Ligand binder design. Structure first.
Ligand code: A1L59
Ligand code: A1L59
Ligand code: CO
Ligand code: CO
Lengths: 398, 398
């Protein structure tokens, strides 16, 4: 006499989508942000396109950890190139970069997904409502790149490889580890990438309309947001979108975002880790020496209630580690999610990072090996309530 | 039975009482990431802040300090936050700051000096030809601040205290140690701050004209002519460089001017109490978010040291200079140890010098020990010594 959650997946992608490729931040200074993030997250300096490379238009530095690719880009003076261009990223434009950065501060310009063919992905998107940002451009007859608007001044970037490198894109030089111990805190890939918009409805119509991504449902049972999740056919590309819920006691954090960010844009990046305990131990140590800071931890009560909730999946010693590191735990139909959120990455209370680990949903593919289903454990919607619960209990125990 | 003498003039012709270098303000796109990077790279503690979390709706400003050295990183918030000020720095302007950063990239906006009275300093300066930037403003009846143009978009900022704080300026909250045992690599104060301009003559005329700073002589191509302006006591030192055109190798000064979009501050020399300690600390962090250093001199350079400075430095101290790539020069009065970083941000503009001065220890009216300003000069000899050592190293391949 149990309960059951049932999921639909129409597999309606209008073109073949593979995986998240990279995230591009537009910065004022690529070098300082890239250096800070490298130390904070344990990402390796892996490729570059700048003056030391021939590029007189923009400085672009790629950091990597597993399959996660973070690109930091900033403009040089236009005066350098006031005389075929030395830029490696065809979309890049001085005007656009400066305007974006003045308007929004440090933030994500481009969410990039690898696809079978960027030309067709772009053609199909425009046909089905997508606003063009940058057209399909082939690079050294090796890579095609196109951009459509996602929300705000964020673009969805399509990347397609002509056939079966660590140089990322044409025009980039590989950087070799200048170290006997290169950095690695266990971050492996991008899990989801969440936008904030003024109204969820139109936003969803737009994106899903041109992509054919479907709604991934969350097991449910005050937070100031209303959200839905767009998902690719295999549910490995996940694009949540939030809107503000007006009226509530505490002002919507989404509404604050929209004010400080001067509009819609990317709110957070959930980075998947092979082991959140390792990652957080590393990141927390670096919090006060140039790394990232974390949101205030749950009360003790939260951790007393974990065995009740996840004592089947997590051992006692793992629950103590969760408490020591301020880790939230949620569970859905299919599996269990460990998560934590940083404080903002730059000056404004806009963009932040989530570290997650997914437990469960191991299944066999056609090769005979295992994979983990995308969205295993959900996105931690349970935790808002589980956190308000634990605070009120903590009070009543005081 | 035959020696040489270098004779220094000092007209002590300052037009107002100057005390010391007070702080340096960098204008950024993102103050947090630059401040975090610098803190880790240079070993400077987070001391104070003025931002949203303190009530500041106009600008985010973060103070790092190491001994008497004070670095301030400032960036603009959206105008819309403060359309209805909470600003701690009265001179700050959204448009000016955006415009600076768009034009010059990461750079020093303000060279700040403590004077006895900022109001009179501004008055006497403007009367003697200075172009005013911000008029004298008194803050919480406690501190007075005024600004005049130094060169390009760099301002000389005057700071005077009413009479007889660790909160730097009114409106700034002190930051306590998040972790006991703050970051400290041995940097103790600013030694000098150097500007690049297109023409030395007009620039010196202007500055000396309104300060009454005298010329400080350098005891005895490199693509530059240099002149040093100095306060009465020679503890405030302000070198200025111009390019020497037609030289074989293009002038590094001329490069600066092209990449920076004009005149601006080229380098900051930071005094260390133990340059060996400082550089071991800084070097271990180079590849993990810190700063990179210029290419070391050839082994020849270190072999020539005992002849040049064997009386001041021991054999083991010379091997240490060789381990760390440290340059050594001498003048009339004493000995200098120096090393230069690679650019601090994207552009080949501003960099940092780390110095230790050895010698000219003297006593004052109180009888307290002081070291004279400029002990050992500024390393002008090292241009030749570098060229020599490279010629010698190349000749001995044989
Ligand atoms: C759709 C979708 N995709 N991911 C989600 N949910 C989250 O990321 C999420 C879960 C839980 C929490 C918390 F429990 F900590 F309140 N979140 C928060 C907390 S927060 O203070 O606002 C943020 C500004 C740190 N933000 N996102 C989430 O929804
Ligand atoms: C006055 C005054 N204030 N500072 C100075 N001079 C220097 O700092 C200086 C001395 C020596 C050398 C070197 F030996 F390495 F060539 N410098 C350099 C070398 S560099 O590759 O151009 C720079 C771009 C690192 N830059 N400034 C100096 O003079
Ligand atoms: Co999330
Ligand atoms: Co110098």
């Amino acid at each position: 006499g149990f309960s059951k959650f049932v999921r639909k997946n129409p597999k309606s992608d209008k073109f073949k989508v593979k995986r998240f490729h990279h995230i591009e931040f537009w910065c004022g200074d690529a070098t300082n942000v890239a250096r800070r993030f490298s130390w904070g997250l344990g990402m390796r300096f892996s490729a570059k396109s700048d003056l030391s490379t021939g590029n007189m238009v923009h400085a672009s530095y790629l950091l990597t950890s597993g399959d996660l690719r973070f690109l930091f880009t900033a403009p040089y003076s236009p005066s350098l190139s006031a005389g075929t261009t030395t830029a490696s990223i065809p979309s890049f434009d001085h005007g656009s970069c400066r305007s974006f950065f003045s308007s929004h501060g440090l933030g994500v310009r481009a969410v990039a997904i690898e696809v079978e063919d960027a030309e067709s992905a772009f053609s199909i998107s425009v046909a089905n409502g997508a606003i063009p940002s940058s057209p399909p451009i082939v690079l050294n007859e090796a890579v095609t790149i196109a951009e459509v608007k996602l929300y705000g001044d964020v673009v969805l970037r399509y990347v397609s490889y002509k056939a079966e490198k660590s140089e990322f894109l044409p025009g980039f030089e590989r950087v070799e580890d200048a170290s006997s111990f290169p950095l690695d805190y266990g971050i492996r890939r991008l899990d989801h990438a969440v936008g904030n918009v003024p109204e969820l409805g139109p936003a969803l119509t737009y994106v899903a309309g041109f992509t054919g991504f479907h709604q991934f449902a969350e097991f449910t049972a005050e937070s100031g947001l209303n959200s839905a999740v767009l998902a690719s056919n295999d549910e490995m590309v996940l694009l949540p979108i939030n809107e503000p819920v007006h009226g509530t006691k505490r002002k919507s954090q989404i509404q604050t975002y929209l004010e400080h960010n001067e509009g819609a844009g990317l709110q957070h990046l959930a980075l998947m880790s092979e082991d959140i305990f390792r990652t957080l131990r590393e990141m927390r140590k670096r919090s006060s020496i140039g790394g990232f800071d974390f949101m205030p931890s749950p009360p003790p009560t939260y951790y007393q209630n974990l065995k009740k909730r996840v004592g089947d999946v997590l051992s006692d010693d793992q629950i103590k580690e969760c408490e020591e590191l301020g880790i939230l735990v949620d569970r859905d139909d299919q599996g269990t999610l460990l998560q934590i959120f940083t404080k903002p990455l730059g000056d404004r209370p806009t963009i932040f990072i989530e570290i997650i680990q997914r437990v469960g949903c191991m299944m066999k593919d056609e090769e005979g090996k295992a994979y983990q289903s995308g969205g295993c454990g959900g996105f931690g919607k349970g935790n808002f309530s589980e956190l308000f619960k634990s605070i009120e209990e903590y009070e009543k125990t005081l």
